[PDB]
Every structure is written in structure tokens, then in C-alpha cells.
């Protein structure tokens, strides 16, 4: 086509989606990870995670307001990944890399899994 | 912080949100523009438009499944802007620039209004 493109549009959209999350505006699901609860937008979760994409395209699960993750999932690892989904920034540290990679594999977040594997290979 | 960032994350999120729109997945509102109807995600509309941000943060309007725009609004201008919201690409043409700018002013989409004013100033 003969379209023009606004370079910063996608970043500005995600920044605004994160502002809505911070003020709990139009969040439509709670993700339960052991004793912790995380409110989010189903569409953002689906856009970032192969697991949430499969869950919310399911004709029965699409209508659930609460999703319980596998008990092996670490709440801090999930929190770091939820922040990444809404900001593009990943708080990857020596103390959390194993939990973050295990959570990203479960959530089917391929680019996160890839950088975790590379950071782990560098330290061996 | 000591975060790393994935450059393409915001673009990939928006691409996936547009795929959901194309398959009518988790769309939660219909925007009526005269005889035309456009299905969309309230969160994406709010993230792109000052008008939709004000509408869906309203305690009564946040619960509406149908929003009727002002009858002066052109359906093609709205369609071009809805596409821009979900892709960052604006199909700006000599034949549609006036309708697109008028719609972007009504929707409170400042960057679109700015490029329209510049393209119009160049042709005078």
C-alpha cells in the first residue's frame, strides 16, 4: 500500500495498556499463582503467551474470570514476566533466571526462553 | 533498573491484537458510525484515542456494548483510523485526508491530526 507509519505507535499503545493495568481499568481476569493473585487483560496475555492464547481461545475457558496456574509456577517469575508483557522490559537477574526461564517455557514465551538460555550458557 | 528490553515486543503485541480483531476474538464493543458497525477491543480504543479513553473510564459507559458516534463522522475515515490503531499504518490519501483529519480531531488522536495538518499545508 501507500501507507505512512508512526514509529512510536506500538510502544505508546503498550505504555497506555500498562497504565490501565496499574489503575486496574478494564482488567477482566485474575491469574492465581499459589497464594498470589495478578489482575490483567486477557487480550494482552494472549498477545504475549502461547499458553494464554490457547486458554482464552477455548470456548469454555474464554469465559472464566479466574485462571489457576500449575503449583510448580513461582509467583515472582510470573510477576517478572507479566511486567515484561506490558513493558518489553525483562528484569533478568542471577537469582531469578531459573524461575523466569521455567515460567517462560510454561507460558510459551519463545523470545524470553531464548535470552534465558543464552544468559545461562554464558555463565557456565 | 538493570532490565534488558526486547526491541520488537510492542510491535509483536500489536500485530497479535490485530490478528484477534481480524478473527473477532474477545472484541467487546461495537462502534456504530451511521449505517456501519465496527467491532473492536475497548482497551485498544482507549490506548489510541482520548475520546475512547474518556468514554470507557466513565462508570456508566464502561459497561455499554454499543457506542454511537456523532452522525457527522464518516465511516471510511473511522475505518482508516481503526486500522491505524491496530497497525501503526495510516492510509492517508488526497481523497480521504479531510475526513481522516476531522475523525482524528473528534477521536482525539493528536499525532494523526498533526501529520494531516502538515500534509494539507504542503499542498496549499
Amino acid at each position: 500500500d501507500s501507507c505512512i507509519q508512526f514509529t512510536r505507535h506500538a510502544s505508546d499503545v503498550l505504555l497506555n495498556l500498562n497504565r490501565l493495568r496499574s489503575r486496574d481499568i478494564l482488567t477482566d481476569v485474575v491469574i492465581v499463582v499459589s497464594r498470589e493473585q495478578f489482575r490483567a487483560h486477557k487480550t494482552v496475555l494472549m498477545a504475549c503467551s502461547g499458553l494464554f492464547y490457547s486458554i482464552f481461545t477455548d470456548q469454555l475457558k474464554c469465559n472464566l474470570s479466574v485462571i489457576n496456574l500449575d503449583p510448580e509456577i513461582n509467583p515472582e517469575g510470573f510477576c517478572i514476566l507479566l511486567d515484561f508483557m506490558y513493558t518489553s522490559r525483562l528484569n533478568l537477574r542471577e537469582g531469578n533466571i531459573m524461575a523466569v526461564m521455567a515460567t517462560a517455557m510454561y507460558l510459551q514465551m519463545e523470545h524470553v526462553v531464548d535470552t534465558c538460555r543464552k544468559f545461562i550458557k554464558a555463565s557456565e | 533498573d538493570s532490565c534488558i528490553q526486547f526491541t520488537r515486543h510492542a510491535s509483536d503485541v500489536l500485530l497479535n491484537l490485530n490478528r484477534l480483531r481480524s478473527r473477532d476474538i474477545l472484541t467487546d464493543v461495537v462502534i456504530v458510525v451511521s449505517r456501519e458497525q465496527f467491532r473492536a477491543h475497548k482497551t485498544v480504543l482507549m490506548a489510541c484515542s482520548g475520546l475512547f479513553y474518556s468514554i470507557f473510564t466513565d462508570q456508566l459507559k464502561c459497561n455499554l456494548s454499543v457506542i454511537n458516534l456523532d452522525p457527522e463522522i464518516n465511516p471510511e475515515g473511522f475505518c482508516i483510523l481503526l486500522d491505524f490503531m491496530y497497525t501503526s499504518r495510516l492510509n492517508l490519501r488526497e481523497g480521504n485526508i479531510m475526513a481522516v483529519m476531522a475523525t482524528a480531531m473528534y477521536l482525539q488522536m493528536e499525532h494523526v491530526v498533526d501529520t494531516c495538518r502538515k500534509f494539507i499545508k504542503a499542498s496549499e
Binding site: C3, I4, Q5 | -
Partner: peptide, 4 residues
């Protein structure tokens, strides 16, 4: 704004 750019030419994509």
C-alpha cells in the same frame, strides 16, 4: 512518521 516514516515510509514503511
Amino acid at each position: 512518521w516514516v515510509i514503511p
